[PDB]
Curated annotation (Swiss-Prot):
Domain annotation Ubiquitin-like: ranges: 1-76
Entry superkingdom: Eukaryota
Protein name: Ubiquitin
First-to-last residue of the parent protein present: 92 to 167 of 167
Length: 76
């Protein structure tokens, strides 16, 4: 499943993922890819902050679903 993330700074990041993967996995796949830790990263889909425990499937995440990446600040 191709997914996109939009970073604060204007940088477009894409990752082929599975729908059964945890969101917490894809925060650590950014640490692999782009160097950013899980801890200070909060991810956004359809207005909602996406939370530990649950999966991209639960949050209905699909083919070219664009997500948003807040560094440190909660809110935005």
């Amino acid at each position: 499943m191709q997914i996109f993330v939009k970073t604060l700074t204007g940088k477009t990041i894409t990752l082929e993922v599975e729908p059964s993967d945890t969101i917490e996995n894809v925060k650590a796949k950014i640490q692999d890819k782009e160097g950013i830790p899980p801890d200070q990263q909060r991810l956004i889909f359809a207005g909602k902050q996406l939370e530990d425990g649950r999966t991209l499937s639960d949050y209905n995440i699909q083919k070219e679903s664009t997500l948003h990446l807040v560094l440190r600040l909660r809110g935005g």
